[PDB]
């Protein structure tokens, strides 16, 4: 309860950590920790009745977020870990179920069968791109095939529990918490041409309420980088 990092404080009360490992450290690298280890809270999305899902690219969403956006442009390489706090606040009269996954290397596929999706359609800088429950038409310029039941990666959406995940069931639970290490083939990689993670939120059992209750449940995603180190003189 009331954990603080740097000059920011959140409030909690179960945490699932990575693939079993805690994030730790390793020309020579420099290790900054004061101006990066803090809670960057993204703005809140609205979960309505006919919602489909959201996704963020993780070393892209904090690209304009304070001094962490300055270390992405001034330094060439770098490696980070993450600590993702998801919490949605609903009353006892609402119902639903979310699935919160953190997929490493989520290569997505274009709607046009010959091209690859362009840069603005894969990742929004601290703004969630959204799923659909239909198909996206092929004859357009360039967009992501974002049918939710195939998760945009050509794979059955029920089997997405093999990646490190956590359930948010509004009957019993309220929040999720993930701690993710650095998973890449090279020990230190570029932070502009590569997104090594992907945070997905998919409503399996959709929201329901009676007439009179508030028709939306806001979700709040709070990310804090752990054990970051860069490469420079």
């Amino acid at each position, epitope marked *: 309860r009331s954990i603080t990092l740097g000059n920011s404080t959140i409030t909690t009360q179960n945490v699932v950590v990575g693939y079993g490992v805690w994030p730790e450290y390793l020309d020579q690298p420099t290790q900054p920790d004061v101006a990066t280890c803090r809670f960057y809270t993204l703005e809140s999305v609205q979960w309505m009745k*006919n*919602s489909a899902g959201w996704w963020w690219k993780l070393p892209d969403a904090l690209s304009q977020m304070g001094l962490f956006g300055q270390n992405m442009q001034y330094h060439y390489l770098g490696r980070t870990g993450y600590t993702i706090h998801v919490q949605c606040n609903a009353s006892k009269f609402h119902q639903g179920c979310l699935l919160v996954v953190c997929v490493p290397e989520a290569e997505m596929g274009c709607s046009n069968l010959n091209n690859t999706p362009e840069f*603005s359609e894969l990742s929004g800088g601290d703004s969630a791109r959204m799923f659909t429950d*239909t198909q996206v038409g092929e004859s357009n*310029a360039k967009k992501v095939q974002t049918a939710v039941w195939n998760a945009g990666m050509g794979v059955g959406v029920g089997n997405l529990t093999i990646f490190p995940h956590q359930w948010i069931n509004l009957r019993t639970n309220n929040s999720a918490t993930l701690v993710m290490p650095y998973i890449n083939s090279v020990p230190m990689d570029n932070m502009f041409r590569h997104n090594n993670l992907t945070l997905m939120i998919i409503p399996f059992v959709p929201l329901n309420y009676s007439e009179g209750s508030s028709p939306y449940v806001p979700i709040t995603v709070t990310i804090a980088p752990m054990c970051a180190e860069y490469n420079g003189l």
Partner: antibody
Amino acid sequence: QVQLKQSGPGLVQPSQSLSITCTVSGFSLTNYGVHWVRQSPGKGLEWLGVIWRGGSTDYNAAFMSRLSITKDNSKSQVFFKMNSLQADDTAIYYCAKGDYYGYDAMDSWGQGTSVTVSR
Amino acid sequence: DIQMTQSPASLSVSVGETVTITCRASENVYRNLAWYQQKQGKSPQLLVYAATNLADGVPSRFSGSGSGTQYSLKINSLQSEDFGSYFCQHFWSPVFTFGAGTKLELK
């Protein structure tokens, strides 16, 4: 939250150029695309063209050579231009933003500037 | 491209009936459909998108159903503010083509 609005020339001579500017408010052009819809009393509604959020455009087939839609992310404005302006273009022109929850539908529309092409 | 044939062209009802407006596509669009309502001399408003889902502030009287090439919209109980023009649009592929249009007189 307040949304987009436009300002146009009002009326043109035949075989002249038309240029309307739709200026937005409260959202960015890096997250949405803007469609251009023409409401006609004779042929009904028709979709003229669109500029996507990446900068790519896609125009109608019948109005391909005459149209050109461009935008600027910084000053938050979209310019479109139609040329040679025959007699059938007596209509009202709307600008409306797309990507309503990622479904490519029109969220909210401009006020519309009706044009008259005759002398 | 693909044409949307909307039927009927006009209707004349009172307050409180069940009406049904259908529009049929030339080929399959995979539920990529939007429904609009335009009043007298104003900008049209989004009513039902993706052929089932309701809009943000649209009341729960409206309903859309259909899949494939056949779609429909229903109002269970009319009110005084529910007449005007209604159009259907596919957003499956460019070029997007609107429907013909229907009118409610509320006699």
